[PDB]
Amino acid sequence: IQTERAVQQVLEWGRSLTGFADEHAVEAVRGGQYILQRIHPSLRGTSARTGRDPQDETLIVTFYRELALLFWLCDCNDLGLISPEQLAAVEQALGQGVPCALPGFEGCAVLRASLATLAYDRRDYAQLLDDTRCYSAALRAGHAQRWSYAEYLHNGIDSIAYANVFCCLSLLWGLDMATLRARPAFRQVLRLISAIGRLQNDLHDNAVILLLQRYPAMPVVEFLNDELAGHTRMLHRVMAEERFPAPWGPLIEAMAAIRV
Amino acid sequence: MIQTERAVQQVLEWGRSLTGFADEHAVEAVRGGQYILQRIHPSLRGTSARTGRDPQDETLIVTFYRELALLFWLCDCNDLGLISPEQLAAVEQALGQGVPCALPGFEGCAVLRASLATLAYDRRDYAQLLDDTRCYSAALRAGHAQAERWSYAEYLHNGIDSIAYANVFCCLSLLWGLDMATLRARPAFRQVLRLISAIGRLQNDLHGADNAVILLLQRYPAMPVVEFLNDELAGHTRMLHRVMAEERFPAPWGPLIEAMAAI
Numbered sequence A: 001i002q003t004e005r006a007v008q009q010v011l012e013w014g015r016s017l018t019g020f021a022d023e024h025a026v027e028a029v030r031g032g033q034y035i036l037q038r039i040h041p042s043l044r045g046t047s048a049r050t051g052r053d054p055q056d057e058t059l060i061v062t063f064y065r066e067l068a069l070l071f072w073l074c075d076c077n078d079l080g081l082i083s084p085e086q087l088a089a090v091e092q093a094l095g096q097g098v099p100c101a102l103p104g105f106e107g108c109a110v111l112r113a114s115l116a117t118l119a120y121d122r123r124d125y126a127q128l129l130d131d132t133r134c135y136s137a138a139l140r141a142g143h144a145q146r147w148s149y150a151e152y153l154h155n156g157i158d159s160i161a162y163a164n165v166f167c168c169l170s171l172l173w174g175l176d177m178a179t180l181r182a183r184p185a186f187r188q189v190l191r192l193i194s195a196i197g198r199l200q201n202d203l204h205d206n207a208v209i210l211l212l213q214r215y216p217a218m219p220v221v222e223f224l225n226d227e228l229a230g231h232t233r234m235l236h237r238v239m240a241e242e243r244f245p246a247p248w249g250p251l252i253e254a255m256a257a258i259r260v
Numbered sequence B: 001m002i003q004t005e006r007a008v009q010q011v012l013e014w015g016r017s018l019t020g021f022a023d024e025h026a027v028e029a030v031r032g033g034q035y036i037l038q039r040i041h042p043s044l045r046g047t048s049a050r051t052g053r054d055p056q057d058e059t060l061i062v063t064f065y066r067e068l069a070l071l072f073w074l075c076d077c078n079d080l081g082l083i084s085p086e087q088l089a090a091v092e093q094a095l096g097q098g099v100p101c102a103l104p105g106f107e108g109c110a111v112l113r114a115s116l117a118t119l120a121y122d123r124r125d126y127a128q129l130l131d132d133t134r135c136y137s138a139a140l141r142a143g144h145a146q147a148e149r150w151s152y153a154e155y156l157h158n159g160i161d162s163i164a165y166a167n168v169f170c171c172l173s174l175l176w177g178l179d180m181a182t183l184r185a186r187p188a189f190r191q192v193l194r195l196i197s198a199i200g201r202l203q204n205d206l207h208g209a210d211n212a213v214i215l216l217l218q219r220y221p222a223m224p225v226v227e228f229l230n231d232e233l234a235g236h237t238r239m240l241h242r243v244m245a246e247e248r249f250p251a252p253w254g255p256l257i258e259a260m261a262a263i
């Protein structure tokens, strides 16, 4: 599959989601192509064991649809694209992997049914449902926020959705994240790359704003930038000290620079 | 409960086998240790029938106090350069690997470590203590190494290890059979561990070796450093409270974490 075929396949499915915008499909495919391209070499290697082809169109489009779903949900929250009633119904459906009870959101059932069918290790599917609920809640709790930088960063780590991205990749290509999750070190890296992602976004409510409202005289911009530097170094140190199975090393690095 | 001065003397007797050990190390260890044991005493009484570990066992108590004195002494070895870099490295090897120290003047290390191994209710806790000892050691040196200054993030991550709460909890679990090795399998438990440790680190830096306050002030002179940290400390406390509520950890973990927050 090239690019517009993927974009159109994501867009076609998006028509079954009220509030879906073209950009949700376009940016999901662009970000998704970026990640898959950076981990391709590592993937084809594991392809021997799993039997999951890096170029499998079905797997690629499903991965892109999950990314589009994440972008769409974020806008639904930040921009009120759909009603609060609709959002609650959609989040309930996506979090349990069942059809939405309200009309105009058939895409939820389609995507989740697909993920269940394609899950290499079904434990990743349950984990994805879990990450979806966490994500939904972090978007809501953050929108409704008095917040300390610590609490902000803790919630932001879940609202950035990197955990969901990793879990979807594991689900489709059999990357055994369900097993790697048991290692405290892996969990640590997950938190760091996510915080990196959250800071990069807030810098590019939001961190900068939150700290400015509270500390008018604080160089919040440089501070937050040092924080980003700080987290990146800690990520590297742990990446070395620990040795994660392909394609996790290139994947984590890919996520760190997705600011391209 | 062994009398205070009798415990101090027992800690001091062992401490005499560590170059640079000072009376203060034993005295402060017994004071902090008694504070902790008194606050979790009712709980330990409750688990004693199951474990066979008596809250008033002098051997267990003195051993816990000696580990606390060890941590105080190590902090000073770094902070005041009581021993040479070569001697500190050898001490870290013995305490972090559980082997005899290759250099003379530190017999107390292998002695305390051997007692802990022998006394461990669940031997996993001993290996955990060795791990926590390595983290604590590395953190003391990293902090002291702190030129290119650390980010607040890097500081707190390191201060979480340098505060030694993990070590204290692990030693308690080893001695009184508190099943920390199993509880550590729960993500929520590991989170409260990082939380209570960050809390202890912030409180220490504010109340009264790189310091959070002097750190943020040298890099961000204009920012209201102290105000910020006090806000971050309240933030960690709120997070801790909610997790402790959501999750209902077996006794004595609730009282133990509560006691550390107030110490």
Ligand SMILES: C=C1CC[C@@H]2C(C)(C)CCC[C@@]2(C)[C@@H]1CC/C(C)=C/COP(=O)(O)OP(=O)(O)O
Residues within 6 Å of the ligand: A027, A028, A030, A031, A032, A067, A068, A070, A071, A074, A077, A078, A139, A142, A159, A160, A161, A165, A201, A205, A258
């Ligand atoms: C919109 C996005 C497209 C997909 C893309 C991938 C490929 C997953 C790589 C990471 C970035 C991204 C998810 C990208 C951005 C997603 C999104 C709009 C983030 C907005 O912030 P978020 O963490 O959702 O919380 P908040 O609502 O912004 O507070």
Ligand SMILES: C=C1CC[C@@H]2C(C)(C)CCC[C@@]2(C)[C@@H]1CC/C(C)=C/COP(=O)(O)OP(=O)(O)O
Residues within 6 Å of the ligand: B029, B031, B032, B033, B036, B067, B068, B069, B071, B072, B075, B079, B140, B143, B161, B162, B163, B164, B165, B168, B204, B209, B210, B211, B263
């Ligand atoms: C490890 C120590 C022994 C036990 C003691 C109790 C009894 C729990 C009371 C709280 C302190 C402590 C945990 C104590 C801590 C030793 C130590 C000096 C903690 C401060 O961190 P440290 O590594 O010294 O870095 P810094 O010098 O504060 O920058």
